[PDB]
Amino acid sequence: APFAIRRLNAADPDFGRHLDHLLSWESVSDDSVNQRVLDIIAAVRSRGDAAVVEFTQRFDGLQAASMADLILPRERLELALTRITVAQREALEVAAERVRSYHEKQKQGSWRYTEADGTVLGQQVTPLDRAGLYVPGGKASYPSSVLMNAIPAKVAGVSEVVMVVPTPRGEINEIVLAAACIAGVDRVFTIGGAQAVAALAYGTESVPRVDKIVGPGNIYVATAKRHVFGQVGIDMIAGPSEILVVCDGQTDPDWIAMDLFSQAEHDEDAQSILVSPDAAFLDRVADSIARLLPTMERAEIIRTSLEGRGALIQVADQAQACAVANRIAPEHLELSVADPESWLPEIRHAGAIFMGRYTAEALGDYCAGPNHVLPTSGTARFSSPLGVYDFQKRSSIINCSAEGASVLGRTASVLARGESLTAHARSAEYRILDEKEA
Amino acid sequence: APFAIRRLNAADPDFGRHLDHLLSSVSDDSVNQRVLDIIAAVRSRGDAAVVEFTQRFDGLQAASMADLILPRERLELALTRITVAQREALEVAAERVRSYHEKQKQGSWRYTEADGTVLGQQVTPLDRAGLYVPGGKASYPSSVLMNAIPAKVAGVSEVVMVVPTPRGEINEIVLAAACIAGVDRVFTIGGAQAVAALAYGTESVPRVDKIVGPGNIYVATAKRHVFGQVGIDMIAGPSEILVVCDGQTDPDWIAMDLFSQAEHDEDAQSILVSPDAAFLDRVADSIARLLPTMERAEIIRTSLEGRGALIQVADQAQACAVANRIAPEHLELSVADPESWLPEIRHAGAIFMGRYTAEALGDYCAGPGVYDFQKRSSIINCSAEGASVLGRTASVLARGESLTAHARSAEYRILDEK
Numbered sequence: 001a002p003f004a005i006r007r008l009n010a011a012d013p014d015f016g017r018h019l020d021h022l023l024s025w026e027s028v029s030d031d032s033v034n035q036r037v038l039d040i041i042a043a044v045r046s047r048g049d050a051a052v053v054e055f056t057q058r059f060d061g062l063q064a065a066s067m068a069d070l071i072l073p074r075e076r077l078e079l080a081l082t083r084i085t086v087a088q089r090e091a092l093e094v095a096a097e098r099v100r101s102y103h104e105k106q107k108q109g110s111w112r113y114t115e116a117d118g119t120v121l122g123q124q125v126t127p128l129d130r131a132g133l134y135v136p137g138g139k140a141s142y143p144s145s146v147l148m149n150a151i152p153a154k155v156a157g158v159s160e161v162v163m164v165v166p167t168p169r170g171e172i173n174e175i176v177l178a179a180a181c182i183a184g185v186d187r188v189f190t191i192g193g194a195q196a197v198a199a200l201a202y203g204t205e206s207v208p209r210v211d212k213i214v215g216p217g218n219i220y221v222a223t224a225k226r227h228v229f230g231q232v233g234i235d236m237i238a239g240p241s242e243i244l245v246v247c248d249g250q251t252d253p254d255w256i257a258m259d260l261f262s263q264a265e266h267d268e269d270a271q272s273i274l275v276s277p278d279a280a281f282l283d284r285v286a287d288s289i290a291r292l293l294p295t296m297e298r299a300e301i302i303r304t305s306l307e308g309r310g311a312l313i314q315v316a317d318q319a320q321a322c323a324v325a326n327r328i329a330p331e332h333l334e335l336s337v338a339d340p341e342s343w344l345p346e347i348r349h350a351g352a353i354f355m356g357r358y359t360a361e362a363l364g365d366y367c368a369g370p371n372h373v374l375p376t377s378g379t380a381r382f383s384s385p386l387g388v389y390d391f392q393k394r395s396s397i398i399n400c401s402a403e404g405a406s407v408l409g410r411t412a413s414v415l416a417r418g419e420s421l422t423a424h425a426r427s428a429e430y431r432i433l434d435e436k437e438a
Numbered sequence: 439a440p441f442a443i444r445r446l447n448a449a450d451p452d453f454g455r456h457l458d459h460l461l462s463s464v465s466d467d468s469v470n471q472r473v474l475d476i477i478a479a480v481r482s483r484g485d486a487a488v489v490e491f492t493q494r495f496d497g498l499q500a501a502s503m504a505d506l507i508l509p510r511e512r513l514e515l516a517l518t519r520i521t522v523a524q525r526e527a528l529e530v531a532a533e534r535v536r537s538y539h540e541k542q543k544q545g546s547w548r549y550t551e552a553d554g555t556v557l558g559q560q561v562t563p564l565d566r567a568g569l570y571v572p573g574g575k576a577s578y579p580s581s582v583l584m585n586a587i588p589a590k591v592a593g594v595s596e597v598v599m600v601v602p603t604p605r606g607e608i609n610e611i612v613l614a615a616a617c618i619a620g621v622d623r624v625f626t627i628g629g630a631q632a633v634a635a636l637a638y639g640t641e642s643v644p645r646v647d648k649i650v651g652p653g654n655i656y657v658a659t660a661k662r663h664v665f666g667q668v669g670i671d672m673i674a675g676p677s678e679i680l681v682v683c684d685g686q687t688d689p690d691w692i693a694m695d696l697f698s699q700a701e702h703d704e705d706a707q708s709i710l711v712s713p714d715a716a717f718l719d720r721v722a723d724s725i726a727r728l729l730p731t732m733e734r735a736e737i738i739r740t741s742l743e744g745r746g747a748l749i750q751v752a753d754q755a756q757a758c759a760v761a762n763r764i765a766p767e768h769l770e771l772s773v774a775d776p777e778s779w780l781p782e783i784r785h786a787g788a789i790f791m792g793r794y795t796a797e798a799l800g801d802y803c804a805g806p807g808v809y810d811f812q813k814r815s816s817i818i819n820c821s822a823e824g825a826s827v828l829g830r831t832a833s834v835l836a837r838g839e840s841l842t843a844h845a846r847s848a849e850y851r852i853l854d855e856k
Contacts, residue, residue: 355819
């Protein structure tokens with residue numbers, strides 16, 4: 001009984017409704033997880049360590065009498081580095097070098113500039129005291145997510161990088177812990193979900209309150225991050241695992257099937273969709289899926305996610321393919337076409353874009369950050385407030401000379417008096433100079 | 439009869455308890471639920487809810503939402519109504535802000551690696567930006583200029599401004615700044631209902647892509663709750679100044695610097711820290727004498743009574759420790775060598791250094807971002823050789839975690855050596 005991938009056709013009169021249902025259905029409703037997350041956060045804020053241990057036992061299936069059993073010492077990170085193979089260690093170190101060299105070039109620090117009248121302007125740049133990094137538990141946890149976050153934090157000078165990674169059933173991902181060692185993670189707690197986010201955002205007896213929480217999470221972590229927003233810095237709210245592949249039919253159908261499998265194997269709720277105007281090509285991809293799926297090591301996960309949210313979508317032409325892509329609004333887009341830069345102008349709603357037949361989004365999961373450019377010396381030339389900038393605090397400074405305060409004070413007086421904010425005006429006017437005054 | 443400002447002393451054993459209370463009126467949970475109710479009502483009832491909340495909270499009469507729309511010609515009219523000096527100040531600041539952001543703008547780019555791989559970003563301006571501007575007198579025109587101008591420089595086609603008009607009062611300097619800054623539409627609405635209307639859209643208020651501009655606790659709380667539905671610039675804290683003084687700045691200056699923040703609104707917080715005990719007495723005297731002379735004395739007095747204080751400390755080191763604990767959004771280092779003090783106060787926001795720099799200069803900046811009004815798509819377009827370099831690293835790591843579809847997807851593109 002070969003697997004029959006779900007098929008959609010934009011020519012069908014019920015296409016918009018059927019695509020609507022594909023993109024929106026949920027087993028666990030919103031507000032259900034959201035109420036659940038809100039209850040976890042308030043419980044961690046009230047009971048601290050005790051709530052973190054209780055929820056870790058329930059949701060991760062862990063045996064831990066106290067919070068001390070949920071702390072991984074840094075020696076355990078070094079032990080992970082020795083347990084992985086030499087080829088895996090070197091691959092991690094190669095990835096870390098490319099990330100580290102890039103963020104070094106982008107790092108900017110404090111500066112001062114003296115104006116003509118003697119007034120000094122500038123910025124004081126200091127690293128955040130503490131950063132919290134969420135790392136998914138189990139096998140489906142890209143070591144990149146450790147490298148792309150902990151390394152720029154350390155390059156910025158963050159003194160304490162705290163990693164939270166759940167260990168469901170005690171399962172530990174040695175490559176993930178080895179990545180943490182290479183990236184300079186300082187402490188690790190074996191916790192996850194909204195509990196970890198709440199513990200990092202508000203602090204418990206054993207988990208330190210951090211200044212910023214980063215990393216990619218499931219719906220529980222993403223929802224918790226949105227709710228602790230304002231209480232603590234956050235990098236982004238990652239959406240569900242998804243890929244949209246757009247193909248003109250000139251890419252190897254086995255490549256395209258495996259590109260769909262790459263996202264489908266991440267988790268059971270993943271969404272993997274292919275759109276193409278080439279009907280014969282779509283049939284070959286369907287054949288490729290049926291032939292390649294049974295012996296995938298994660299075939300059960302791939303089959304579940306493709307059954308729930310996978311599809312091959314037939315469209316009339318390149319224009320309709322871009323229209324469907326814009327409706328889907330994918331955070332990850334694989335433009336597997338001969339002329340990807342020609343398709344891009346008609347792509348209005350897309351995050352990270354993988355172009356051409358030689359670029360799979362699997363490269364995005366392992367060589368770049370979420371919707372970040374590949375780190376190279378060439379791309380380092382283009383500044384970005386992400387990376388090292390995200391782990392720094394900036395304080396504008398102004399140090400007026402006596403004469404500079406007089407010039408600026410006259411302008412401040414005019415506008416403050418015009419608004420009847422007379423304390424503003426008088427404060428500035430106190431510093432206005434008149435050399436003939438004795 | 440004369441006002442006696444609150445006094446704290448770090449030499450007191452219970453100083454930490456008093457400072458904790460000073461830094462901690464209307465409860466957050468009370469405001470939070472009101473904000474949640476307002477957002478839900480605007481989402482459900484649209485224009486009707488916006489008009490209702492505007493009548494109730496801004497004390498005006500508006501038959502419909504059409505009475506709450508200001509045409510762009512009203513901004514041009516405002517520019518004709520302000521004084522010559524006010525207009526020149528706004529136009530000079532605008533040129534400096536606009537010229538600066540033109541230089542800093544970065545559009546789409548591509549870089550080609552030696553192996554043929556192309557990397558870059560597709561950069562597009564946001565379609566619409568919403569700008570929150572406080573109503574009435576206590577509304578700095580710099581907030582308009584420094585938000586709307588980078589949006590227009592980025593290429594945002596529609597900058598929508600929301601400004602409440604309490605009892606119908608209009609600030610012509612604010613509207614003139616909006617004219618100069620290129621604001622496209624204006625709605626005379628404020629509070630959480632304005633934030634909700636911009637974030638979700640109503641019949642008359644367009645849904646925007648990002649909401650910027652500082653507001654009081656209702657606006658900040660509303661922005662915190664619409665995050666995710668819409669982009670936001672920041673969540674402002676209470677209006678605040680911490681003055682640190684070594685005792686050698688004129689005490690009337692320091693008192694007025696405290697008054698400058700205290701006059702913004704009744705929940706503003708103005709604190710002074712000094713090791714000089716006699717100086718603090720002089721500032722207390724200056725406050726008592728100057729307060730009844732101020733146009734906004736009632737607001738200043740309420741702010742100082744509720745949240746103000748003069749704090750004695752032992753020395754420069756303890757002054758900075760207290761300052762770092764306060765973590766002020768604005769810090770005025772009214773000392774002889776301010777660059778010697780700053781290293782010990784890393785948790786402060788904007789810094790005003792020396793005896794000649796009042797924090798009021800920050801609110802009325804004369805001019806010297808764009809990135810915040812652009813959307814970016816990261817692009818990777820591997821050559822066959824580039825996909826082999828990246829694929830060899832990805833293949834090993836993916837197979838190490840048994841993510842074999844990741845590995846095989848990358849391995850399809852790996853070329854053999856020789």
